[PDB]
């Protein structure tokens with residue numbers, strides 16, 4: 001629904017590049033880090049691999 005990126009990206013088509021949701025973890029299991037370049041969708045607890 002929204003993201004705050006400090007790079008030059010096309011905000012009209014940026015929201016369809018969210019990180020892949022693998023499981024229930026930190027950042028849907030995509031990064032295992034502190035932050036991701038883009039926020040994962042909020043409902044990654046129900047829809048993930």
Ligand SMILES: *[C@@H]1O[C@H](CO)[C@@H](O)[C@H](O)[C@H]1NC(C)=O
Nearest residue numbers: 022023024025044045046048
């Ligand atoms: C996420 O999935 C795991 C199964 O791998 C489950 O044990 C856990 O309770 C789930 N978390 C939520 C918030 O649904």
Ligand SMILES: *[C@@H]1O[C@H](CO)[C@@H](O)[C@H](O)[C@H]1NC(C)=O
Nearest residue numbers: 026031032033034035036037
């Ligand atoms: C994320 O924050 C925690 C808080 O202490 C820190 O330990 C960790 O190093 C941070 N992650 C990265 C990638 O720096």
